[PDB]
Design a protein around this ligand. Sequence first.
Ligand code: CA
Ligand code: CA
Lengths: 217, 218
Amino acid sequence: EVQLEESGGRLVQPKGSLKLSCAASGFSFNTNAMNWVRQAPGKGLEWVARIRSKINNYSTYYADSVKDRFTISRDDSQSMLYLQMNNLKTEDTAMYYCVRGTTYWGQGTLVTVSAAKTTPPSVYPLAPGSAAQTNSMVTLGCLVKGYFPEPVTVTWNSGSLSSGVHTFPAVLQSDLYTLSSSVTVPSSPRPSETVTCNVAHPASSTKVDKKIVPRDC
Amino acid sequence: DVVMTQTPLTLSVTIGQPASISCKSSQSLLDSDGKTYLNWLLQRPGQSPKRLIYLVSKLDSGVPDRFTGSGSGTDFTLKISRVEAEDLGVYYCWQGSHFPYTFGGGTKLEIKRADAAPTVSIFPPSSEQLTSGGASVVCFLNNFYPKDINVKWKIDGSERQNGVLNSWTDQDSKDSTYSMSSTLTLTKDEYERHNSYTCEATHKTSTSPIVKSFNRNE
Ligand SMILES: [Ca+2]
Ligand SMILES: [Ca+2]
């Protein structure tokens, strides 16, 4: 199958530089025009750069906002598309997609341009105080506070608990993100069967497990 | 640059009902070679965009016949004969005729479902957090519809407006419902010199709000 895998995304300081990569497979890369398209957090798609095939002498095109700063290139021998980004600005913060023509999009790689520094989150369990006894369903959660940059992923019981999970998108308050996740299980499992959220902040190489324990005295 | 105008910004449709979305260009997309490079893409939540239509009306492989692309020059239409749950997401038109290759602003297709009251859960600050010097009180408002809800925070009967952070999930993949998280953050000191913490949920499903509360020591 056609596969496009972007690599490179991370936190860069304003005026900094970053090179993105895209590994293409399952098609004749060397005969295709390739594009970079970006999407700013919660925004629409924005076309960035285009590179033609060798037959068209690798002609390059750029959106006005990135022209002279961004460099699109390709290595046909390795089926690799590249995006070198110099003099980065905060408004360049986006998810960057590798696109074969106008047909197939990769998964995307997140680029954060900010003066804020990498900060691992604090992981807080959400356990009911003294809430309703004969409540057939029990809701539990995890509060993931004070991290940067995005993303953060939450998983429950190492991915076993899938149903009943509500993962809330992160909200940036003061150069720090806050996210929460909830899990609804029958009153038969928890407390008897333990409930743990698995939090991952790849940017700070943080992997934290928090067991949800009933509220003590 | 060619300006691509998409309308409506959002629409709410019942599964099995038709949908029609517009895309207009500031100049004709009919290219020098006689072909019109107008694509329709769907971005499902958490997914990357997927092209549905190309060359105005050509359906991509494995794209249901329920989708129809039409128009010419500057006026384009994407029509869905009857919507299915999997149609939910943001639709984009993308022109490839003139450089720079522009996109429309997007149209968010939402799934219309029956109203449903939220189920409300309240959570006090964890010990982990109190030890760290902060105190956050959380409220989960689960599986409600419509999205529009108001959450009021009350400390010892008195309304607090600052330090409140709200987040909504996307429509549930099976339900089409929303869930919401409401976090009240205050200092460990402020939290400890107060006993009653309440979050009040006012949703169209009832005139009376859904109240959930806790007391530091009980
Ligand atoms: Ca221009
Ligand atoms: Ca052209």
